[PDB]
């Protein structure tokens, strides 16, 4: 054993109480298999890049290009349903870009145009920005022409020195007259003798005024949010109370993700009772083996078998020929053997250890099966992935990794199908991939017949 | 197609559409992140729920549905029912504490937002720690993990901005990674700097001798406790391994690992050994008293290598008595019928 509690043959079939070791020599150490549990799946390059993409064929996707498109990078394929339009209905199986995808989920149009000086555009925009629904092409009037060419409502941001009126509670505490006592009315200087309304023009910073300390004198945007702004929603209990109540009750989710009616996102501004309700709805958008794993599970091969049977003998030679090739794969799958949800990978079998040696050489040199540098690749990526998800998750970086991860999963399986991995500067040599082991210039079945 | 360009484009495009303004935007997000913290804790205080739990429920509602909770973290939080229960009590928090809920989420957003914006910062940094033995994307990614770390500790009360703050928290993360993953045979950070020092020193030494320094110079130039045994050792660990599979001789088809023999495996000669040895050792073990012979047979050949602790109840005198008298009658009759003499070893 490792520690030595049991050391001979009499008890050959039992395991040690404090440490686990059942024995017959180290051959067990070269025959046993371990596995890595992948964060978010990836797929076998052996099934994705063979001339006939066995998954592109079975899953009617662009046999060769739609795959490469969503697999390695972020090109999303709407998996189940996505009510909101592009111009046309939800594309059951079609794929879209980051850009247009972006335009969807947050809200139609994003326009942040922030004014140059403090008094010219800051006034044009402000007057028409807070409660006024700004129609498309709203020609803001000062630097050049601030053009807001899109939809529903508007949200402006900062304000320096010109005149303060109707703005949020920021400046309220600054000039103590209104937040300390009810003096905002007298704040209007001299004509009061003959909601926000401040002095003629006394403050010029984005600060806190204990002593002008916590400050930030800068710019002032006028970002137009294309979304519909509700101020006084009411209670109707047919379906669960949607949106909000007058002022007391607010059943909506906070200001990220909330689906009420056909419109599906809800931002919240506790300033005035304003429940910002964006319109894009639940659009299942996925990319990577995640998406394909789904698609693959959902298919009832029997149906596509029968569907192809009809497509095969009936229409003309162009689409029926494609269907005959696509019927081949689906048939065997069903025929005898195993079912097709397995082509996706989420559990990587690891090759034995003594088969990927770590050995002492000369002086103290060591020698290890190239396979091990590839395994570490994957393990590190898989780990870093986990920790990246847990720490918090900025989209770009999660995919970025997921990508590396994928590539890695290729590496051990087969190197070179997509780029070729290298041991660090010394040998620009393809680390022998498991594949390279089986086939290779002088691989396994191969030298299995050259001689022994 | 090719992996670097795509991500470069990927975040450079997003920074291109959203860089953070020097003061305002970074100030803004910062303020929100902190308020979130103060919020989540105050939530913990009034719900009796761990800040860890309050942090994960707000994350789910702002960053991702049941999909992101089920695959990443296996399953302890019921995909639907669990998180939701938690959101309900958050709602119930009247006007006063509901405010914190609404703040927590928005703060959470800011976080991820600030994190997005300063990804150029990482890449610019990570760019220079390139040839250390880590993949550019791996390097940017650790550095990324580093910027996220900075986000947790930055105090906006202390005027300095996130730029100079992220730099450190990122450079730390990178260097660590470089020292932790770069090699197959792990080597702690100290050995690492040690090796850099060793290298650097060897450089200054190559400068004038015209003689690649004998390990004498390196010891000297290095400092306090450096000797020849130390340097020969360090550079022996510095050599990365070799591809057990490498093209050898005329690289036509020579893979290095066929030439290394095997040691545990009993080459035929040994299997034959163990047979006679065990059969004859077993014959002698029987024709003898199953007393002090088995004691020393089991004490030596069955467990571990204790005269006193060797025999059951009978003390030392009977041990040495039968050990040495049976061991010799056994050897001297084995001297007669010479079977063992020819040293099986
Ligand atoms: Mg026990
Ligand atoms: Mg036991
Ligand atoms: Mg124990
Ligand atoms: Mg072909
Ligand atoms: Mg069109
Ligand atoms: Mg229409
Ligand atoms: Mg403005
Ligand atoms: Mg007005
Ligand atoms: Mg104003
Ligand atoms: Mg009044
Ligand atoms: Mg009057
Ligand atoms: Mg009067
Ligand atoms: Mg005045
Ligand atoms: Mg002023
Ligand atoms: Mg202000
Ligand atoms: Mg102060
Ligand atoms: Mg400024
Ligand atoms: Mg009514
Ligand atoms: Mg109801
Ligand atoms: Mg079906
Ligand atoms: Mg059917
Ligand atoms: Mg076709
Ligand atoms: Mg050797
Ligand atoms: Mg590597
Ligand atoms: Mg987390
Ligand atoms: Mg390497
Ligand atoms: Mg090849
Ligand atoms: Mg291509
Ligand atoms: Mg406390
Ligand atoms: Mg209590
Ligand atoms: Mg407790
Ligand atoms: Mg939900
Ligand atoms: Mg489990
Ligand atoms: Mg967001
Ligand atoms: Mg590396
Ligand atoms: Mg490189
Ligand atoms: Mg690594
Ligand atoms: Mg030191
Ligand atoms: Mg150096
Ligand atoms: Mg000398
Ligand atoms: Mg090293
Ligand atoms: Mg070869
Ligand atoms: Mg005898
Ligand atoms: Mg006897
Ligand atoms: Mg006996
Ligand atoms: Mg007898
Ligand atoms: Mg014993
Ligand atoms: Mg003992
Ligand atoms: Mg003892
Ligand atoms: Mg005793
Ligand atoms: Mg005695
Ligand atoms: Mg004889
Ligand atoms: Zn043991």
UniProtKB/Swiss-Prot annotation, chain A:
Region forming the signal peptide: none
Residues reported in the UniProt entry to bind Zn(2+) 1: 1, 3, 16, 19
Origin superkingdom: Bacteria
Subunit structure: The RNAP catalytic core consists of 2 alpha, 1 beta, 1 beta' and 1 omega subunit. When a sigma factor is associated with the core the holoenzyme is formed, which can initiate transcription.
Family indicated by similarity: Belongs to the RNA polymerase beta' chain family.
Function: DNA-dependent RNA polymerase catalyzes the transcription of DNA into RNA using the four ribonucleoside triphosphates as substrates.
Protein name stated in the entry: DNA-directed RNA polymerase subunit beta'
Species whose genome carries this gene: Thermus thermophilus (strain ATCC 27634 / DSM 579 / HB8)
Highest classification ranks of the organism: Bacteria, Thermotogati, Deinococcota, Deinococci, Thermales
Gene that encodes the chain: rpoC
Residues of the whole record sequence present: 58 to 621 of 1524
């Amino acid at each position: 054993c490792a520690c030595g509690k049991y050391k001979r043959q009499r008890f050959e079939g039992k395991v040690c109480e404090r440490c686990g070791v059942e024995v017959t020599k180290s051959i067990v150490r070269r025959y046993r298999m371990g596995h890595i549990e992948l964060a978010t799946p990836a797929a076998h390059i052996w099934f994705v890049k063979d001339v006939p993409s066995k998954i592109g064929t079975l899953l009617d996707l662009s046999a060769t290009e739609l795959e490469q498109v969503l697999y390695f990078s972020k090109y999303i394929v709407l998996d189940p349903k996505g009510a909101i339009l592009n111009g046309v209905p939800v594309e059951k199986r079609q794929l879209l870009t980051d850009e247009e995808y972006r335009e969807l989920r947050y809200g139609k149009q994003e326009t942040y145009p922030l004014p140059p000086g403090v008094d010219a555009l800051v006034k044009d925009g402000e007057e028409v920005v807070k409660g006024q629904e700004l129609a498309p092409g709203v020609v803001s009037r000062l630097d050049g022409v601030a053009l807001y060419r899109f939809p529903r409502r508007v949200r402006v941001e900062y304000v320096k020195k010109e005149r303060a009126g109707l703005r949020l509670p920021l400046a309220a505490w600054v000039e103590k007259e209104a937040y300390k006592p009810g003096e905002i009315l007298a704040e209007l200087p001299e004509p009061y003798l003959f909601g926000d309304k401040i002095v003629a023009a006394i403050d010029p910073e984005e600060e806190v005024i204990a002593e002008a300390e916590g400050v930030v004198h800068l710019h002032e945007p006028a970002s137009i949010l294309v979304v519909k702004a509700r101020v006084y929603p009411f209670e109707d209990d047919v379906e669960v109370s949607t949106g909000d109540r007058v002022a007391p009750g607010d059943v909506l989710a906070d200001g990220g993700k909330v689906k009420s009616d056909v419109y599906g996102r809800v931002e919240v501004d506790l300033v005035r009772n304003v429940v910002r309700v964006v319109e894009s709805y639940d659009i299942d958008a996925r990319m990577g083996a995640e998406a394909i794993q789904q698609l693959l599970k959902e298919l009832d091969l029997e149906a596509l078998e029968k569907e192809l049977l009809e497509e095969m003998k009936h229409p003309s030679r162009a689409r029926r020929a494609k269907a005959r090739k696509r019927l081949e794969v689906v048939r065997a799958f069903l025929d005898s053997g195993n079912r097709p949800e397995w082509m996706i990978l989420e559990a990587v079998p690891v090759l034995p250890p003594d088969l990927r040696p770590m050995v002492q050489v000369d002086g103290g040199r060591f020698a290890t099966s190239d396979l091990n540098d590839l395994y570490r690749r994957l393990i590190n990526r898989n780990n870093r992935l986990k920790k990246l998800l847990a720490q918090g998750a900025p989209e770009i970086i999660i995919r970025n990794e997921k990508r590396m991860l994928q590539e890695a999963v290729d590496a051990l399986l087969d190197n070179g199908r997509r780029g070729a991995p290298v041991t660090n500067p010394g040998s620009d040599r393809p680390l022998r991939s498991l594949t390279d082991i089986l086939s290779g210039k002088q691989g396994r079945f191969r030298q299995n017949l050259l001689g022994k | 197609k090719i992996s670097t360009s795509d991500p470069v484009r990927q975040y450079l495009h997003e920074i291109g559409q959203v860089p953070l303004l020097t003061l305002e935007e970074e100030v803004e997000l910062a303020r929100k992140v902190e308020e979130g913290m103060e919020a989540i804790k105050k939530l913990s205080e009034i719900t009796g729920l761990d800040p860890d739990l309050i942090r994960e429920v707000v994350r789910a509602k702002i960053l991702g549905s049941a999909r992101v909770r089920h695959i990443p973290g296996l399953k302890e939080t019921l995909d639907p029912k669990t998180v939701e229960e938690i959101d309900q009590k958050l709602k119930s928090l009247p006007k006063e504490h509901k405010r914190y809920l609404h703040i927590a989420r928005e703060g959470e957003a800011a976080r991820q937002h600030l994190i997005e914006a300063n990804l150029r910062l990482v890449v610019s940094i990570a760019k220079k720690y390139t040839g250390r033995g880590l993949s550019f994307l791996d390097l940017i990614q650790e550095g990324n993990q580093g910027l996220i770390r900075a986000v947790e500790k930055f105090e906006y009360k202390r005027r300095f901005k996130f730029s100079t703050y992220a730099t450190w928290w990122i450079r730390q993360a990178i260097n660590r990674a470089i020292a932790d993953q770069a090699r197959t045979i792990r080597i702690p950070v100290h050995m690492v700097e040690t090796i850099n020092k060793l290298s650097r020193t060897a450089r200054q030494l190559q400068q004038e001798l015209g003689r690649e320094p004998t390990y004498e110079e390196i010891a000297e130039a290095m400092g306090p406790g450096w000797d020849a045994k130390r340097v020969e050792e360090t550079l022996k660990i510095a050599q990365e391994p070799v591809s057990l599979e490498t093209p050898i001789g005329d690289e036509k088809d020579s893979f290095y690992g066929d030439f290394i023999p095997d040691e545990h495996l009993p080459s035929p000669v040994d299997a034959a050994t163990q047979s006679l040895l065990s059969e004859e050792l077993e014959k002698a073990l029987s024709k003898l008293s199953e007393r002090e012979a088995m004691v020393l047979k089991l004490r030596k050949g069955l467990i571990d290598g204790e005269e006193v602790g060797a025999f059951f109840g009978v003390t030392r005198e009977r041990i040495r008595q039968i050990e040495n008298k049976a061991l010799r009658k056994l050897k001297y009759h084995e001297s007669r019928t010479r079977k063992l003499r020819d040293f099986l070893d």
